[PDB]
Amino acid sequence: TPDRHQFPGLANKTYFNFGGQGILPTVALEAITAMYGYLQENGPFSIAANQHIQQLIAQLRQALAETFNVDPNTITITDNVTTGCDIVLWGLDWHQGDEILLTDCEHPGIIAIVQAIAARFGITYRFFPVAATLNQGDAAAVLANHLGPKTRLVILSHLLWNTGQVLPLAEIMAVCRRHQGNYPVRVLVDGAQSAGSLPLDFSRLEVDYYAFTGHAWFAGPAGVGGLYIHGDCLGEINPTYVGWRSITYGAKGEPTGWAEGGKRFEVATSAYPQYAGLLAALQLHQRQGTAEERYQAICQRSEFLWRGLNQLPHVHCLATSAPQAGLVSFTVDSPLGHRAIVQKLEEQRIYLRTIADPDCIRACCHYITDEEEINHLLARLADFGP
Amino acid sequence: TPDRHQFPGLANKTYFNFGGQGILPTVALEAITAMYGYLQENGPFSIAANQHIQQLIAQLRQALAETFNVDPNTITITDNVTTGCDIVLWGLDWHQGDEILLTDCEHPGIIAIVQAIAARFGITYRFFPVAATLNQGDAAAVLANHLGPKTRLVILSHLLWNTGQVLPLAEIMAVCRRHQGNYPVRVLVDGAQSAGSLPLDFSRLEVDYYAFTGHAWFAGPAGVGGLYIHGDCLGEINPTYVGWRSITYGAKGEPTGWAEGGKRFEVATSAYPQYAGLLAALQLHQRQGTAEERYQAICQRSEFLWRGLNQLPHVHCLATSAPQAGLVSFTVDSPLGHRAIVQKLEEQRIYLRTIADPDCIRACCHYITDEEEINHLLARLADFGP
Numbered sequence: 168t169p170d171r172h173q174f175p176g177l178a179n180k181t182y183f184n185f186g187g188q189g190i191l192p193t194v195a196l197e198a199i200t201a202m203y204g205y206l207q208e209n210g211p212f213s214i215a216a217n218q219h220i221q222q223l224i225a226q227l228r229q230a231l232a233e234t235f236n237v238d239p240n241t242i243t244i245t246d247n248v249t250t251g252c253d254i255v256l257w258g259l260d261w262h263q264g265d266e267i268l269l270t271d272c273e274h275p276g277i278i279a280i281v282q283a284i285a286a287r288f289g290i291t292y293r294f295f296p297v298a299a300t301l302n303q304g305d306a307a308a309v310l311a312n313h314l315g316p317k318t319r320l321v322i323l324s325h326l327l328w329n330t331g332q333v334l335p336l337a338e339i340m341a342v343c344r345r346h347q348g349n350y351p352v353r354v355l356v357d358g359a360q361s362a363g364s365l366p367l368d369f370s371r372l373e374v375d376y377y378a379f380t381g382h383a384w385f386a387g388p389a390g391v392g393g394l395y396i397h398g399d400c401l402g403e404i405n406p407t408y409v410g411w412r413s414i415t416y417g418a419k420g421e422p423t424g425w426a427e428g429g430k431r432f433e434v435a436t437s438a439y440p441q442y443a444g445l446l447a448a449l450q451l452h453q454r455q456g457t458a459e460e461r462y463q464a465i466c467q468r469s470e471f472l473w474r475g476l477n478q479l480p481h482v483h484c485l486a487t488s489a490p491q492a493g494l495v496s497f498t499v500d501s502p503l504g505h506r507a508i509v510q511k512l513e514e515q516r517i518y519l520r521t522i523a524d525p526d527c528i529r530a531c532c533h534y535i536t537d538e539e540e541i542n543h544l545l546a547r548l549a550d551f552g553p
Numbered sequence: 554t555p556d557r558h559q560f561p562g563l564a565n566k567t568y569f570n571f572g573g574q575g576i577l578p579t580v581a582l583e584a585i586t587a588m589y590g591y592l593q594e595n596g597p598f599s600i601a602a603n604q605h606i607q608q609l610i611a612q613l614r615q616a617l618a619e620t621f622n623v624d625p626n627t628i629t630i631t632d633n634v635t636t637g638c639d640i641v642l643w644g645l646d647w648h649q650g651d652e653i654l655l656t657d658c659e660h661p662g663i664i665a666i667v668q669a670i671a672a673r674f675g676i677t678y679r680f681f682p683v684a685a686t687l688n689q690g691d692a693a694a695v696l697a698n699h700l701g702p703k704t705r706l707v708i709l710s711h712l713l714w715n716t717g718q719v720l721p722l723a724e725i726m727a728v729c730r731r732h733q734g735n736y737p738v739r740v741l742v743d744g745a746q747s748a749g750s751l752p753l754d755f756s757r758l759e760v761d762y763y764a765f766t767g768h769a770w771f772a773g774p775a776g777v778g779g780l781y782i783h784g785d786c787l788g789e790i791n792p793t794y795v796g797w798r799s800i801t802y803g804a805k806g807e808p809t810g811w812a813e814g815g816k817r818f819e820v821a822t823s824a825y826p827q828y829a830g831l832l833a834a835l836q837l838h839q840r841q842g843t844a845e846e847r848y849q850a851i852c853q854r855s856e857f858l859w860r861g862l863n864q865l866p867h868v869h870c871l872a873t874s875a876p877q878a879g880l881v882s883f884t885v886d887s888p889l890g891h892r893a894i895v896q897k898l899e900e901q902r903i904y905l906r907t908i909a910d911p912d913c914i915r916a917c918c919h920y921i922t923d924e925e926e927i928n929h930l931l932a933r934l935a936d937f938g939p
């Protein structure tokens with residue numbers, strides 16, 4: 168039984184955009200405001216304040232580590248999902264002619280990094296079709312049919328932001344591992360949608376690099392994210408953007424080496440109070456139940472919505488079977504067009520989003536979502552037709 | 554006449570750490586809290602919320618542009634000073650053998666980036682002594698005696714964080730411009746201390762690249778900063794860390810190019826409410842008077858402190874003439890040591906900081922600082938002796 172009162176934003180609106188940004192819980196707002204008060208009272212720049220901040224950073228790094236069942240050393244703190252991807256990509260020792268493989272469902276921001284890399288190191292990239300594997304086929308097999316001699320890295324979203332498909336990461340990892348080419352194939356995972364909705368254990372699940380953010384499904388504030396790097400891959404990633412938070416210091420205050428673990432990829436001054444906000448949101452989710460129970464709760468709500476949409480004659484879900492996670496994508500048979508339909512809905516305080524490719528509308532159902540909100544969505548969607 | 558009441562943190566303490574982080578003005582805390590409320594009420598992810606954020610970003614970009622008297626197109630928004638430096642350094646098309654010159658008073662974080670670059674592109678770097686030019690000599694001349702055939706970039710702090718000297722930037726720029734080698738010599742300026750205290754007009758002052766932050770002298774919240782790049786140098790800087798905020802989009806939502814001006818160096822989701830905070834702080838400073846009046850106010854206070862320290866027999870200021878800005882560094886003749894002396898002072902709610910090189914203590918005087926706080930500092934410093 169979810170405590171909806173902890174998320175005051177739920178009232179007087181019908182929110183289905185958790186995948187864009189989660190509704191901020193009261194405890195998170197409180198922790199943010201309290202941090203500003205602490206800095207004002209004790210600093211903001213001083214021995215006591217600087218200590219309190221270092222302690223806060225360590226507490227967030229630890230909560231994130233526990234979240235994925237890994238050691239604090241494998242966790243880097245960033246501001247969003249993308250930065251984590253920039254860290255891995257710019258850190259690899261790319262050689263002219265190396266190749267990168269991406270699914271055809273990756274975020275335009277990520278593709279932009281790859282383009283920048285290709286132009287800088289003369290590497291090449293190409294996509295492999297996974298979108299079409301929502302209701303049939305096998306993305307792992309598709310990848311196998313694309314792996315080549317110079318394939319060095321594969322980039323994929325564990326949960327696709329556009330179609331709602333949960334890719335078979337374990338199988339894809341194996342495929343990459345057994346492959347034999349000029350490089351051991353490594354996989355960078357974009358977890359923008361998976362983290363905070365899917366139960367994730369990186370000690371029971373082999374992963375090389377996993378990027379995520381705290382402002383979507385974890386419901387933290389905009390501006391705080393993180394990155395996971397398996398201990399065996401750390402060496403392969405050279406720090407790129409660095410600062411006073413990336414190194415260790417000498418007797419005269421000079422740089423003497425890299426800071427321990429993932430700290431070497433952290434740059435400098437950040438919005439610390441936001442860190443306290445994410446910490447509070449993380450702890451609030453553990454008090455609501457285990458990751459597994461929250462995931463099933465999410466799936467019960469997504470299936471309820473999915474089922475409701477199947478009944479609507481002019482609505483067509485992309486998934487022919489029950490959603491594997493909280494994302495439900497669909498099209499609407501109407502002359503208006505999806506963009507105008509999302510605006511009409513927002514006019515009635517119903518919040519969903521449009522998806523560019525494929526051209527559809529997407530609803531996100533979280534464990535705090537209830538049947539009344541879903542029925543209200545269904546009621547309004549019912550007014551559109553050909 | 555400064556309105557000290559706008560900075561509630563001033564009361565019940567004696568703050569001299571503006572150069573580390575400024576005291577947050579009430580109006581900034583209000584704007585931060587209001588932004589969280591707007592996102593909760595209208596989103597946080599939605600058409601209305603996304604529009605409000607884009608408008609907020611444009612307003613801050615413009616206020617910063619106006620601050621330095623330049624075009625909005627030359628301003629990039631970052632999270633701190635260091636990131637601006639990473640953008641310029643990683644963006645240049647380095648060639649094996651190129652050389653970088655840095656003064657012997659640059660931040661250890663900046664030096665760390667240069668070492669990372671040297672190791673990646675095989676470039677070399679060396680320092681030129683400016684610390685000793687606080688009371689005599691000429692840093693521009695020192696630079697002239699260090700310029701070489703392969704010198705491509707020079708890195709310097711406009712206002713030195715350790716000694717408090719204001720380098721002759723105009724002269725240094727001329728020296729670099731008239732030099733003839735294999736490259737036109739460009740200069741990256743670290744303005745962590747200069748921005749917000751020194752009056753800066755980049756349309757009257759020739760500058761290639763100028764990095765800064767909003768949480769020190771501008772008194773904004775930790776986590777928001779920016780970078781200036783002259784329109785003629787924009788083409789030389791290749792975007793490195795990029796994301797969905799760095800590009801323009803196509804018909805199917807795919808990347809089609811770089812976003813206009815400085816936006817190409819912005820990555821992805823950020824702490825937007827903090828942006829509103831910096832905007833509010835920036836506007837509060839203009840209501841207090843012009844940049845010139847605030848600078849003179851700052852200098853009157855620094856000289857007052859400097860003069861008071863000259864009277865103390867066991868205190869020795871590094872500057873033999875009146876400080877050129879708000880930073881006042883000095884040593885103390887005592888067996889205790891500077892670190893122990895900064896801690897005792899903090900125990901009395903008097904806030905200063907230690908400096909590693911040279912080994913001294915630094916006080917920062919802002920236009921909101923008053924004679925009573927300075928006398929209280931002098932009173933307490935008087936108890937230390939050999």
Ligand SMILES: Cc1ncc(COP(=O)(O)O)c(CN[C@@H](CS)C(=O)O)c1O
Binds near residue numbers: 249276324392796
């Ligand atoms: C799959 C995916 N990858 C990256 C992002 C970008 O996240 P940051 O801003 O770097 O944290 C996203 C974002 N998704 C939401 C906004 S476009 C959404 O509405 O799905 C991904 O989905």
Ligand SMILES: Cc1ncc(COP(=O)(O)O)c(CN[C@@H](CS)C(=O)O)c1O
Binds near residue numbers: 660
């Ligand atoms: C000259 C200089 N350059 C960079 C910084 C780092 O700033 P960010 O954390 O990137 O904003 C600094 C910082 N100075 C303060 C210590 S962190 C200080 O008190 O001097 C510079 O001074």
Ligand SMILES: [K+]
Binds near residue numbers: 479481483484
């Ligand atoms: K249907």
Ligand SMILES: [K+]
Binds near residue numbers: 863
């Ligand atoms: K003296």
